[PDB]
Amino acid sequence: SLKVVSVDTLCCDAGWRNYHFVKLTTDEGIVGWSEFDEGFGSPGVTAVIEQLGKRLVGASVMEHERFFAEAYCLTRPATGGVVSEGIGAIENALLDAKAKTLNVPCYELLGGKLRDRVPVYWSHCPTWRINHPKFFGPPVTDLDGVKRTAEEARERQFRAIKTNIFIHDDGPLHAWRPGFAVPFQPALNVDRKVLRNLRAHLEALRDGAGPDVEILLDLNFNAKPEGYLKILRELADFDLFWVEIDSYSPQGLAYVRNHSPHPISSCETLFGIREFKPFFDANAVDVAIVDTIWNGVWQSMKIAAFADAHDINVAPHNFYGHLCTMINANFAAAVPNLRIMETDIDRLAWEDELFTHAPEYQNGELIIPDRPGWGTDPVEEAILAHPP
């Protein structure tokens, strides 16, 4: 039969965080997989999946939009956030299982591919080497290291890199992430210290990158509109591919964009057309970042179509393990209005052990695989060799 027989979750060590997986098995023995995350502000996703998966057992593996519709009904009052992340993770395992059942790559379920390769940017560059040097080396501890990291990206034929906010001139190099309470300074004001350190960091990065490697700047939720404007004025003459600002104020973000000489990207934390809509109605973004790991890829196709009608291109949010990269590769293959795809090029020493296949890059582009499903499977024995 095509019934779902079981929905299980798994977790393994990823150094400074864990990876999580959904494992869905059908009556025929097909196994669909997804990867999800709890580290990025999302405690409780596993608990959601465990409850929702119980309702799925006995249903058709083929009927993923039925599952979505029922799940949305069952959790309507507390929809969004971690509930919606659980639903998305299950969706992504359903899609894998369905594609495997039909012996096709997942992009074959998504309209077919319309490109073979996807341009990427090397994300958390040099953020991972600065923040998690125990896992991603060589460690970066000063402006010369920042420069060398951009040189390495250039040498390795990557066409774009993304950094965050770093303080260089007040002790050991450290990230500035007050929006996530590191440090706890909840007003999120921007001062001369933030501005001059942003400038110093970005100048070093540009010096290493050369003029032909693009630089993206992610500000996450680390200011208010007032402070974002201050940052954009400071950096008015810099060449930036985008400045990324997460906000729950469509009006405030739109004000910021209207005064920006740089492209503004946002939306990586939002769910469904409903949450994206106020931003598009307000002209708040140049680029919409879609987290397909959170939303589910089928739901993400809906969001992509919605963006397309507003002539907005989309970029996947992708900063997890190899399975997330392959999930996003399939989305990226099928979406016409694709800006670029995020990926982390800094990998854990045991990353390749955890998965059957690793993503392949050539000349700054990700090669889209053609195996049934997403293109890689977590390896159960290897997961258990890396307890969280």
Joined together, the tokens standing for residue 323 give: 């399975």
Residue that is written with structure tokens 């593996």 in the block: 61
Closer CB to its own copies, 155 or 239, in the complex = 239
- Name the minimum Å distance from CB 381 to its own copies: 27
- Name the minimum Å distance from CB 127 to Mg ion: 10
Which positions ≥6 away from 278 have C-beta within 8 Å? 250, 284
Instruction: Please report which helix (H) or strand (E) contains residue 242, including its range.
Output: strand 242-244
Q: From the list 218, 344, 346, 377, which residue makes contact with Mg ion (rule: CB under 5 A)? A: 218
Restricted to residues 142-171, the positions that interact with its own copies (CB under 8 A) are none
Q: Is 295 one of the annotated binding-site residues?
A: no
- Name the minimum Å distance from CB 223 to its own copies: 9
- Name the minimum Å distance from CB 62 to its own copies: 5
66 part of the interface to its own copies, by CB under 8 A: yes
Residue whose Cβ sits closest to Mg ion:
269
Burial of 177 (0-12, 13-18, 19+ CB in 10 A): middle
Question: What is the DSSP annotation of 12-49?
Answer: EE-SSSEEEEEEEEETT--EEEEEE-STTT-TTHHHHH
Q: State the number of binding residues for its own copies (CB under 8 A).
A: 100
Closer CB to Mg ion, 33 or 279, in the complex = 279
User: How long, in residues, is the chain?
Assistant: 388
302, 339 Cβ separation under 8 angstroms: no
Joined together, the tokens standing for residue 18 give: 């864990």
Restricted to residues 218-247, the positions that interact with its own copies (CB under 8 A) are 221, 224-226, 229-230, 233, 246-247
Q: Is 268 one of the annotated binding-site residues?
A: yes
Q: From the list 29, 134, 311, 362, which residue makes contact with its own copies (rule: CB under 8 A)? A: 311
| Residue 126, preceding peptide bond in cis (omega within 30° of 0) | yes
217 part of the interface to its own copies, by CB under 8 A: no
Q: From the list 3, 113, 347, 357, which residue makes contact with its own copies (rule: CB under 8 A)? A: 113
Closer CB to its own copies, 241 or 355, in the complex = 241
Restricted to residues 1-60, the positions that interact with its own copies (CB under 8 A) are 40-48, 50-52, 60
Q: Is 218 one of the annotated binding-site residues?
A: yes
Which positions ≥6 away from 367 have C-beta within 8 Å? 116, 117, 359, 360, 361
109 part of the interface to its own copies, by CB under 8 A: yes
The 251-280 site mask, x for binding Mg ion (CB under 5 A), equals ------------------x-----------
Q: Is 365 one of the annotated binding-site residues?
A: no
- Name the minimum Å distance from CB 245 to its own copies: 11
H helices of the chain, where?
45-56, 64-74, 81-101, 127-131, 143-155, 192-209, 225-234, 250-258, 272-281, 292-295, 297-309, 322-334, 351-354, 380-384
Query: In this structure, how many other beta carbons lie within 10 angstroms of the beta carbon of residue 324?
Result: 26
Q: Is 162 one of the annotated binding-site residues?
A: yes
Q: From the list 10, 175, 305, 379, which residue makes contact with its own copies (rule: CB under 8 A)? A: 305
Q: Is 220 one of the annotated binding-site residues?
A: yes
Restricted to residues 141-180, the positions that interact with Mg ion (CB under 5 A) are none
The alpha carbon of 165 is separated from its chain's Cα centroid by a whole number of angstroms, namely 18
Joined together, the tokens standing for residue 240 give: 């930036």
| Sign of the four-CA dihedral 175, 176, 177, 181 | positive
318 part of the interface to Mg ion, by CB under 5 A: no
Q: What are the residues binding Mg ion (CB under 5 A)?
A: 218, 269
The binding site for Mg(2+) comprises 77, 218, 244, 248, 268-269, 275
The binding site comprises 77, 124, 162, 164, 177, 218, 220, 244, 248, 268-269, 275
